[PDB]
């Protein structure tokens, strides 16, 4: 049999009957009869009397707790009872489910919660993804603040980045005290991130004072552990919008569901015990007699009761009676004063609902920081390379940048390459911040009656501020999108099999040869095709029967013998002939380059950066670092 106890809510008589009803709900591999009790008020004598009478007159094997109005100093009495009577209990909700670290030696409490350091790990995870690193610590005079101040410093040395700490302040935030001193202390600070550890009443006092002394506007950010935040179903005033916390799984379930989970855990533990020895141990509830030295039978049962799984949710308890490896969920206050999920956490990898931290304001219209922008690009092997993150540690290998191929659900790849290194250097010199996202539609650009796809389209319709990568320059593009100075010069080039004296050769000028009709490349919807069509009609007419999937299949077709000539960009073609199976080659060489242009950073018209980042590109080109990048990323064997 099992026991159930309620506390301090709207009187759950109907809920008590609902819990009592399913004596044979059959979802558990056992048939232990359930029963219920309920205490009117919460107090030492009341709780002691009810539990002692119940287990001494009922012969129960396990008891499951259910918490109350969230008052402290309640878990201690339950640990006392467990240590004395050697009867395992289990908490599911409320303030009793707050980790009591140095529990009594011979007891079995098994409260479901998360330790302070483990709960701080997720906070330092979310700080890493947005790269804030300000670390203004505020902790009230609470009996547990000495542990928080040590745990933060302990986790500070268990991570990669330096975590430059700014200032740690302890202020008397109780009911009675001098408000002026704390006003002076809070008014004298400057740090774009704050982490505070207080209690609910202390949290309200602190946030009211902070709102008084201008630290709650759209500039700063707050983070608090789950000890604060109260009810989670009644956020009070003076709570800043954007307050972040990390609550555990099942922060939205029902009380009956949580009691059901507790009974499921007890039943699974007992059943797993039977598959080894085959009997549920007899009770020991002599509350009045208080006997019992160390008992190996109940010790074996408890040792067996630690680990348990249930259809996706694993509840693995540590020696200390707090579960290890849970699936925590980050929550934040939406713009309408309503808690909402932001980021999950499963198996040491963090996720986020937004690629940026949405930042609010007093009138609630959201603003974007001036030193911020959104960059678009897509895949081209010499310049932009996409790699899925390895299973090593969640984050991507250093000297790589997180990038996402948008289309709401996302998978965070990371991008590496030439233009990405240029972008990193630019972000380091021009003092700005960026987020990089790939494109979905056609590769580079086109105009199907004003419907511009690609990066050019993404810039022309004001959804981005730059577009970096393999993007050439021509008259029709530069009409609507601006451009910086070039940094890699390209053109048109012909690759052949290892036979022509240029484009104006009669083999390309006159497609009227009888036995051999030459064959062409021209990956369509691209850069060169526009020029080739607009300047040579007959070549365009004859060029329909040309291989067109990528710069990948063309190499295979040329090596096979189904194509006689390939026409494409210069910087990619002459590199493709660097490391090749054997040595296929192009015509005379850089002397054969047609319509010599270069790559460029596309920008929005009349953009204040254009002048900002043209000078930086010129400076980089001047001193030869570009040559080092060229010899690191653009070298071949043949």
């Amino acid at each position: 049999t099992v026991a159930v106890v309620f506390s301090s809510s709207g009187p759950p008589q109907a809920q008590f009957r609902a819990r009592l009803t399913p004596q044979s709900f059959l979802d558990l591999p056992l048939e232990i009869q359930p029963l219920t009790v309920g205490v009117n008020t919460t107090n030492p004598s009341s709780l002691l009397t009810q539990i002692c009478g119940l287990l001494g007159a009922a012969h129960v094997h396990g008891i499951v707790f259910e918490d109350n109005v969230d008052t402290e100093a309640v878990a201690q009495i339950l640990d006392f009872i467990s240590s004395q009577t050697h009867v395992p209990i289990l908490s599911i909700s409320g303030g009793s489910a707050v980790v009591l670290t140095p529990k009594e030696p011979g007891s079995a409490f098994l409260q479901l919660g998360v330790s302070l350091e483990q709960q701080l790990q997720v906070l330092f995870k979310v700080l890493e993804e947005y790269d804030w690193s300000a670390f203004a610590v505020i902790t009230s005079l609470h009996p547990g603040h000495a542990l928080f101040l040590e745990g933060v410093r302990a986790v500070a040395d268990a991570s990669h980045v330096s975590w430059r700490l700014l200032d740690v302040v302890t202020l008397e935030l109780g009911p009675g005290g001098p408000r002026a001193r704390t006003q002076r202390l809070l008014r004298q600070l400057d740090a774009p991130v704050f982490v505070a550890y207080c209690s609910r009443e202390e949290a309200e006092v602190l946030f009211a004072e902070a709102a008084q002394a201008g630290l709650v506007g759209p500039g700063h950010v707050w983070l608090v552990p789950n000890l604060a935040l109260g009810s989670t179903d009644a956020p009070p005033a003076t709570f800043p919008v954007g307050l972040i916390s990390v609550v555990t799984e099942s922060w939205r379930l029902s009380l009956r569901q949580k009691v059901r989970d507790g009974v499921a855990i007890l039943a699974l533990g007992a059943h797993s015990y039977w598959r080894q020895h085959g009997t549920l141990p007899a009770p020991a509830g002599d509350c009045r007699v208080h006997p019992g030295p160390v008992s190996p039978a109940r010790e074996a049962f408890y040792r067996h009761l630690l680990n348990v799984t249930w259809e996706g949710r694993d509840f693995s308890f540590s020696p200390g009676g707090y579960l290890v490896q849970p699936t925590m969920v980050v929550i934040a206050l939406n713009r309408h004063r309503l808690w909402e999920m932001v980021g999950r956490w499963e198996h040491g990898v963090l996720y986020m609902k937004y690629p940026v931290w949405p930042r609010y304001s007093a009138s609630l219209q959201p603003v974007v920081d001036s030193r911020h922008l959104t960059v678009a690009t897509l895949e081209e092997r010499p310049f932009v390379i996409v790699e899925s993150p390895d299973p090593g540690t969640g984050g991507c290998v250093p000297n790589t940048v997180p990038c996402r191929r948008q289309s709401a659900p996302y998978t965070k790849l990371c991008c590496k390459g030439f233009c990405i290194d240029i972008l990193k250097k630019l972000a380091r010199v021009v003092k700005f911040s960026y987020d990089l996202y790939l494109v979905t539609n056609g590769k580079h650009g086109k105009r199907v009656r004003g419907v511009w796809n690609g990066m050019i389209g993404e810039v022309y319709y004001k959804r981005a501020d730059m577009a970096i990568g393999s993007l050439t320059i021509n008259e029709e593009r530069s009409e609507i999108v601006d451009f910086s100075v070039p940094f890699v010069e390209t053109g048109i080039s012909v690759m052949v099999a290892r036979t022509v004296s240029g484009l104006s050769d009669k083999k390309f000028q006159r497609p009227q040869d009888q036995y051999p009709p030459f064959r062409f490349g021209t990956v369509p919807n691209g850069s060169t095709e526009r020029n080739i069509r607009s300047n040579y009609r007959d070549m365009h007419t004859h060029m329909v029967k040309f291989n067109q999937r990528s710069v990948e299949d063309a190499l295979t077709s040329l090596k096979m013998g189904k194509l006689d000539a390939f026409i494409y960009d210069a910087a990619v073609l002459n590199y493709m002939a660097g490391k090749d199976e054997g040595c296929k080659l192009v015509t005379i060489g850089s002397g054969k380059v047609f319509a010599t242009t270069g790559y460029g950073i596309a920008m929005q018209k009349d953009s204040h950066w254009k002048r900002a980042i043209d000078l930086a590109l010129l400076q980089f080109l001047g001193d030869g670092e570009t040559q080092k990048l060229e010899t690191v990323w653009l070298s071949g064997i043949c």
């Binding site: 660097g578 490391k579 010899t631 070298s635 071949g636 064997i637």
Partner: peptide, 16 residues
């Protein structure tokens, strides 16, 4: 020629 600065066979990985 396996140089010390950078060899294209060493800089760009090959098959053999």
């Amino acid at each position: 020629r396996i140089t010390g600065i950078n060899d294209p066979r060493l800089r760009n990985p090959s098959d053999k």
